[PDB]
Amino acid sequence: ADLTEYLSRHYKAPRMVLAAAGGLEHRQLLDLAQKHFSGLSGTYDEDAVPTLSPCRFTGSQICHREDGLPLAHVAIAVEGPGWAHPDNV
Amino acid sequence: GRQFGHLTRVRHVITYSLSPFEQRAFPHYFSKGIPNVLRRTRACILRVAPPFVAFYLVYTWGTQEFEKSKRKNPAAYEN
CATH class of the missing domain: 3.30.830.10 (Metalloenzyme, LuxS/M16 peptidase-like)
Known part of the structure; x- marks a missing residue:
């Protein structure tokens, strides 16, 4: 449950980038992204709280x-x- | 002499420490210090203090005898 919650909390579309490099073509990758990835933030959270607080550095x-x-x-x-x-x- | 690097063998101890510019130089100077001095005082009075009151007592007596014995004296020579 700790894992599934961490996943749901974080593996959400707007924080993911599908990247590729080589003998491909952008449209094919876009098509595939739409084919196999559409349906991740068909939800998107109300007050969740995904913000990063700054980190104090200490001498x-x-x-x-x-x-x-x-x-x-x-x-x-x-x-x-x-x-x-x-x-x- | 002896140099850092050749003093002795130490294994397994971690030391955590802060930069002076990150901490206070007098944190709880009074809050914790006063209690601390009271405590070091208690811990040593019985050994330090007694010999000195012993000298003190001999100091006052000793001078007392000195004055009364010689000067003040001329006690009785009656005729």
Whole structure:
């Protein structure tokens, strides 16, 4: 039930993209999308709540000390801007 | 001397920590500190305090005897 609810909650048309690349033609893919995919948001929710809240970044450290391991792994990072920001280039 | 990297062997302990710019430097300074000092005080009074009152008592007595014995004195020489 936890799964079916997560599915219903999320595998909804407007958050899905059917993508393809190769020796195809757009119309064939569109036709197929209409043939095999029509009937997903024949519903579409009233007050559901699919919104994403921003995530607080914290200047912090986590150290898992294990002298039994032969080499150290270390990963440092500062807060990035996000997919949309042109600063990414 | 000794260097970080060659001190001793430690296995299995995780340390979580925050950036100073992310936390308070005095959180519950009074709320938690006062209680804490009361508690460290209780924990040590019985060992620290007694020898000192013992000196204190000998301090006041000692000077008391000194004054009454020599100066104040000239007690009786009656004729």
